[PDB]
Assembly symmetry: D2
Homo-oligomer: 494 residues x 4
Amino acid sequence: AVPAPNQQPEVFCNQIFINNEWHDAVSRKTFPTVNPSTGEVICQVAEGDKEDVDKAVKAARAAFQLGSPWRRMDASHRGRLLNRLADLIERDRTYLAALETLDNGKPYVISYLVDLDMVLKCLRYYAGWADKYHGKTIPIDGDFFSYTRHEPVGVCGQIIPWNFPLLMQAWKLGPALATGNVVVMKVAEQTPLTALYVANLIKEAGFPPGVVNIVPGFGPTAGAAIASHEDVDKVAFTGSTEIGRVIQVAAGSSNLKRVTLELGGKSPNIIMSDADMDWAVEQAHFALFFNQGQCCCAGSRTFVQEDIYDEFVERSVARAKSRVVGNPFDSKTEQGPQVDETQFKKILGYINTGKQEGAKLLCGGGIAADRGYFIQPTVFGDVQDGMTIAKEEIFGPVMQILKFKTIEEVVGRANNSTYGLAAAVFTKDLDKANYLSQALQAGTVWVNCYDVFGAQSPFGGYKMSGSGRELGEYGLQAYTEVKTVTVKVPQKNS
Amino acid sequence: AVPAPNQQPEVFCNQIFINNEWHDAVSRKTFPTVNPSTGEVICQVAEGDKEDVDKAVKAARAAFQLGSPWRRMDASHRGRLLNRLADLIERDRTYLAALETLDNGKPYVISYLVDLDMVLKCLRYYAGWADKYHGKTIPIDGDFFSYTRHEPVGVCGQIIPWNFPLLMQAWKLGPALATGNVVVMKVAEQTPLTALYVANLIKEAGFPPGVVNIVPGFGPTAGAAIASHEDVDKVAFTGSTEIGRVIQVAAGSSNLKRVTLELGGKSPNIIMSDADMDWAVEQAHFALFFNQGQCCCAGSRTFVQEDIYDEFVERSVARAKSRVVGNPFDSKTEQGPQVDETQFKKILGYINTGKQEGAKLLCGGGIAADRGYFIQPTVFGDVQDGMTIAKEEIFGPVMQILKFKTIEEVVGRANNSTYGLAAAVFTKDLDKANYLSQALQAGTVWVNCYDVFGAQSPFGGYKMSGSGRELGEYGLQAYTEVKTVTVKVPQKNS
Amino acid sequence: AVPAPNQQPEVFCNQIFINNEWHDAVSRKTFPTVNPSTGEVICQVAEGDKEDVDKAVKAARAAFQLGSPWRRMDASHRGRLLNRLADLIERDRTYLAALETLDNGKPYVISYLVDLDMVLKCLRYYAGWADKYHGKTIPIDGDFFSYTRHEPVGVCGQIIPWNFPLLMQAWKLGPALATGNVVVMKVAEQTPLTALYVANLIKEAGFPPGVVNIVPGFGPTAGAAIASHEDVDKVAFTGSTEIGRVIQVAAGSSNLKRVTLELGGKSPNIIMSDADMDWAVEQAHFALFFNQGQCCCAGSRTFVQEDIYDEFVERSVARAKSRVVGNPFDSKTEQGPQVDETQFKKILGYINTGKQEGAKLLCGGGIAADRGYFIQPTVFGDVQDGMTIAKEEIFGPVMQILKFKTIEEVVGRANNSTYGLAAAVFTKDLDKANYLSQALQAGTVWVNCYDVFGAQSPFGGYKMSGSGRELGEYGLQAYTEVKTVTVKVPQKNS
Amino acid sequence: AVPAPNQQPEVFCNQIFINNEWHDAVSRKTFPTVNPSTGEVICQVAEGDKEDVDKAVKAARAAFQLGSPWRRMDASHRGRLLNRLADLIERDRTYLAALETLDNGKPYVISYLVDLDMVLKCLRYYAGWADKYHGKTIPIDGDFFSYTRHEPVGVCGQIIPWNFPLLMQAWKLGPALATGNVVVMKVAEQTPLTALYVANLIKEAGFPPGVVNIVPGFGPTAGAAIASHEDVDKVAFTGSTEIGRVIQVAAGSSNLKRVTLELGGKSPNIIMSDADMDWAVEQAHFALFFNQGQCCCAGSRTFVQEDIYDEFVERSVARAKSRVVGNPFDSKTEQGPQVDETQFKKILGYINTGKQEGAKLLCGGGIAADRGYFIQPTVFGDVQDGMTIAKEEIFGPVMQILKFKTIEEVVGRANNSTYGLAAAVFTKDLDKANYLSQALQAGTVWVNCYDVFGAQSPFGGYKMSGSGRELGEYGLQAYTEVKTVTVKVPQKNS
Ligand SMILES: NC(=O)c1ccc[n+]([C@@H]2O[C@H](COP(=O)([O-])OP(=O)(O)OC[C@H]3O[C@@H](n4cnc5c(N)ncnc54)[C@H](O)[C@@H]3O)[C@@H](O)[C@H]2O)c1
Ligand SMILES: [Mg+2]
Ligand SMILES: [Mg+2]
Ligand SMILES: [Mg+2]
Ligand SMILES: [Mg+2]
Ligand SMILES: [Mn+2]
Ligand SMILES: [Mn+2]
Ligand SMILES: [Mn+2]
Ligand SMILES: [Mn+2]
């Protein structure tokens, strides 16, 4: 039961957020943000650059000074504040769900039922962690009392993508704020609106000035400024593997700030012959087409056992063909437009490469509307490992279906990738589930399911899909600076 | 009561260690390792470079293959092997203590009682972690069974310094091997002998070929080869902040391998007026002069309250003057020579800089012997924050003594550094100890003691002194790759 | 600045709570609950017995059945429910604060600011734990995948006292509900009203029927019925050491249900000569006189160093004499009446005993008003260890001041008790604080403070003061049953 | 590879172990220990009673005094000693393996390869936990520094059974000693020899006097003295559910000492139709017949799905018939004699009762030899839930085979028991394994395996099979007393 959306939600925030105040970029320059469904401009947004980031870092640093409201605040109260933020977000759930769709292109029903639900669940999860991330008392040798203090890492720079604007923001603010840090966030230029509105709610929730600062702008400008800043203690990046490299290099070249990376992938979805056919087909479809295929953990390599290959392919094609593409605000819509023109063109480029390489085009393969960035649900069959569409992240509605024979074989092929963000196994056999779930070199391996995210279960990648983990208790590790205090005592006893 | 050392221990290992075999460099080239006490060459060592590193990485990769002896081995048995290694090291304790001194210069009494004790204690500590670093079963939403697998990160490249050859090796091998990883270790060209011998013991301990591979050689050559290798999953470096940046840069430019850094520092030792004078004076002396002042956490900025300044300085100068400098094999010797000519010259350069800037030279200040790299225990009084000797890591027997008035003042001054490896507070007052230990931005804050390391308590830096932590349970984080496995279940129940 | 209290709150709940419904005792019997300030009956309450408890256990058991709403409910949602319960309690804070005073006698200012604040904090704290008490994935030998499920203990019987009605209820419900258990609670016959109203809010909060059942009644009847019940999986009791013995015996004689006990004590408050006099005096007074001295961890043994003894005693008597005793609803009141006539008489008996034994009565020692159960703040000086008032829990406004000389002496004397719930050390010296906090055999040692409770810090007794802990992460251990699942896999790897 | 056993090992220890010395009972009385294979007396053993226990408790209490060798010892050193004890046991493996069989009756091959291997693994495992059971630093509200100290519980009474003499000793000594506690152990009168010899090794290993005291004797005498002792802080019992209740009552009646219990069971071994027949048959045989059927977690209720019932029974009967019964020192021997005459007769009694109730006797059913306590491997078919042999712990070579149809059916039938120690599920289906492993109310659920014990995985019972857990990290909870130290600080900061 979803409330009726406002298909033209008003924009109240489009500037730079620093010290709980709205500012225009120092240069006074702005950039337009487009509605991917119409190709039309929504509004103008403050284009932050290095000088703006510098202002934000100074505000954050200030808020992190020993004896400041944020440093002196009870850990339990940070939990109250995070829960309050979640309440304000839920209060404006219908509005944000619409604004998310307006700016991003994803179906409103999904923004409402999936996106914001996961935002609330994440913040509320982390509100619980606020006063429970214990340090330790250590049984060190000699007459000493040793213990550790789990302190905040300090000023954290958080750079996020455009595929899940609100959720990606939540995945960052939740753990950072729960551990007492201060942030300077760089939202994606393609989808800055929703995160900016949340900042208004952060001020309403009562978070002290400078605790959270949002700088909307471009990557090589605002982004690089954060990653290279001499006073940024930590940087958390989510985006392309390519920019992940740029981020780590910048950290090493600057002040050696701690780094975590949530990059891309080419996750294999393995379908064994003893799989529940209906279930595997519907799930494999979701595994790839979810969020216009714009998901890092997209099951873009569907390996199907040869015995059930034909039937699986047949049903998959049928399901893809029936997938309703259209205006994201229409409840009938299963797939909206791609985020922007650049992405739209890149996907079309890959589709063309798929055909050129000899991949069997089974359906779709072209534009789905003469307005907006709509692409037809595309399916390629008989894909080979060496093919470009089987190695590179397409980030669109393009499905690769490969055929395999043995379990040993599929393990090697699934693992022969520089990525390793996710993986999936569909089987009814206990031994096969365990054999594969252990053999697969991926951050997350789903069995008889896909895209199952839990604020309590960590998510991150193996190899070049990233480093470090988000969500769960693990998501706190990167936002903590450990201090050992070893005190001399008159006489130590057990 | 140390056993009689063999002042001229024979060298049995001087090559490259790969697959439990000794190999000459592909180029057949060798480099000499010198005895800092005599300036004479001890022997020739195989000079490993990129091609040799590639041989080691291939060996380690092979040893990490699913189904291999190392991957199939019980975690508990890894602990057995680590305890075995420890036994072999304890059997050859006097030999290794002597060889350590021969190649490093540090007093034999210290190599035996301190260095090798801490090696044994670190290895035995981690042997216990081998089968206790549990993953988790998570209470995720929906009908799913979610749990994490704490897998080894993979091929770990480990680059270490020369100040504590054996100890630094242990600090790395302990956690890496305890978690089931394989390594390619690059020992310091100045002190490669002992670590190579330990490799012999690893083979005798029963570790499978390729699990631990050691490549002796230079930094820009062997070291950079490791940090830039496309098949090294993680890299752990300990050394200068300068090279730390090169390491992180190389990681980002290559395969995005995980990185932890244990860099240098300019640690402040704070002496409050209510401190036990005698203890503070002796501890302060040890805090700086320990290991010829060649310790990362050396208390190179001794802040003393104005009320007890004069007396503390007087007593400090007296203690430095009586510090016996001589042949490291002489039981009377408290301080041996600096590791090499480069360090020798660099320290002398800093001493000259101290004088040039107006720092009051109180004692020492020059060469202590016409043979070997001996430098006199030097003390500078009335040091100011802006002076070079008050800002840069001298890494030699040079003590800086500064005067302060208030506790708020010393906090700001102590924290006014791009370093933050350690710190110390000497006071009898409960409130002062707590206030200071909290306020100080250091990775380890010692209260009424200094240089108290515990295999159970984490060690690492804040700011540019590094990232990550070694020792304790934390030492295991960087050597684990988390895998979330979420399985679909008929119906989840609490 | 507390809201004006309704000095005669209306009672809405006075029956037995089962399956979210109100029932009269099967016997139809009722018992009166008295207002200790007036001695007048407030109202009648349903007198539950064995048969009523049998109904409650059946309801609880039913709600705990696999597949039931409560068992299927997401752990995160349990958190939501607990946070909701907390909001309702806060909504009705002014009413509940008043009712707590009317039924218990403690000052309204304290019920509002202290009691209810701690209720909220406890509940919100535990709401956070709901989805974070992870099980483990274990690195067992051989080809097996071993892990542990942290399941609910099941049906938990919870018996609580009357000194902190609301608080004692929260400390029991928070951890139990957060872990997914169902409870059958037996509230103290002296103060049953507030807990009954909270049951109403539990229904309003949305907790499934039978998850929380509350049976008001007497101990030998209702309490024993729960303790000896063949279908209660676990019992958590808080009360006198006497009854704790009865509870553990009952559990052993019945179904071997798991038991944890929070009994009484005779906690020592040690005042060293270098302690801040003003602070020590005010704190020691609070340590004993808090909640009319009706606190399990009251510092009933104030040890003061001989050099500052006379001064401390003099100030203490002055503080006790100025303590305003009166109508708990009058904002001027610091001390209300004892809970009931039984306690009133028991305290009077202890006061007479103290005089009889030769303890120097310094002030008070008699009845404070001719109506209600008010007793004058009493102070006994020169108390000796063998004295009864120095060994037994008085649970009334009767302070015992003992004199000591050395620190070794006081340690032995403080530990010479069968109790060991809490202890306190007042000193400015770092070494004294560490020496004593380690030496003292007490569940909680406060340094330079008293009665500092934190929903995140455990609380429990050493020796006969109890077993198991409450609050903190520790409070969840007793509400969890661990299940090890060891699965056979094709080939185990790290 | 099994070394040749000494069929008549000499006995060196047969007295009471207190303060590292051997004592005769105060009464000078002794009791005989019989060789179950011959019925002949091996030797006389000191008969400890209350007065002896009192001596042992006084010795243990002394060794636990603050400032004592054991209390001051480094946690890591405790680990050294535990590993030392393990080495000494391995040195005397062959001897202890023989003496274990001589006194217990189990096959020597099993005593060597299984029993002593598990002892060694348990000890070495816990040696590792010595310095890793961290306390916590807690984020409490207000200006305070709160942390917890994980202290030893104190004097621990440990009463164990006779089925696994050495192993049961290890399971108790490992966790207790690793946590710094002192023990008073009451070994089974039936098998006291081996435990007394290990006491010798304890002294040789270097454990301080009074740390481990061993009192051989009877239950109602020595055992009850321990459980009822006013100075025993905690009791850990492993035996019959019946005595478990006596133990808990004793603790409640005395000083409210902490209690954990490892009682018996009537564990279900569920074989679904899709199970690997050969494997299920061989494992089910092992599940019951292991250690002459004298195992607490014995799969005494073998449920088999109707479709594979006949085949399963046929094969099981054939396997039971071929099971070689004989002299435990003969390599061919799979099954030795029962521990003693009492068990021998009790088991025969149950066999009679089984026939009486209409259970289909398929094989065995009587005495296997006219000397010693040998019983034929017995199998009963068509067992019904209501039968005595399907409800009571037989603790002998008597197999119960029940037939079932559905999975929902088998869950309720398996759970319909007051016991809940273990359970097993044999199936190839992933969903069935997870459904059953979650549904079964057992402390341990083995999937496609049985009797898989891991020092790292917890073991304990649900319901009346016990409370608390042994092995793994959990095994340390019962041996730790949590102390919370809450210190006032000038100003708390994150
Ligand atoms: N924090 C410490 O423990 C520590 C250790 C060593 C040196 N220092 C500082 O560094 C100075 C001396 O240099 P050093 O040799 O001791 O340290 P370093 O940073 O030069 O080298 C440490 C390790 O890194 C290797 N290495 C060198 N260049 C490398 C490169 N480009 N890429 C990869 N690896 C490389 C070296 O061979 C060695 O194994 C001292 O004067 C002192 O200021 C601090
Ligand atoms: Mg847009
Ligand atoms: Mg050298
Ligand atoms: Mg009352
Ligand atoms: Mg016997
Ligand atoms: Mn981009
Ligand atoms: Mn260098
Ligand atoms: Mn009572
Ligand atoms: Mn018995």
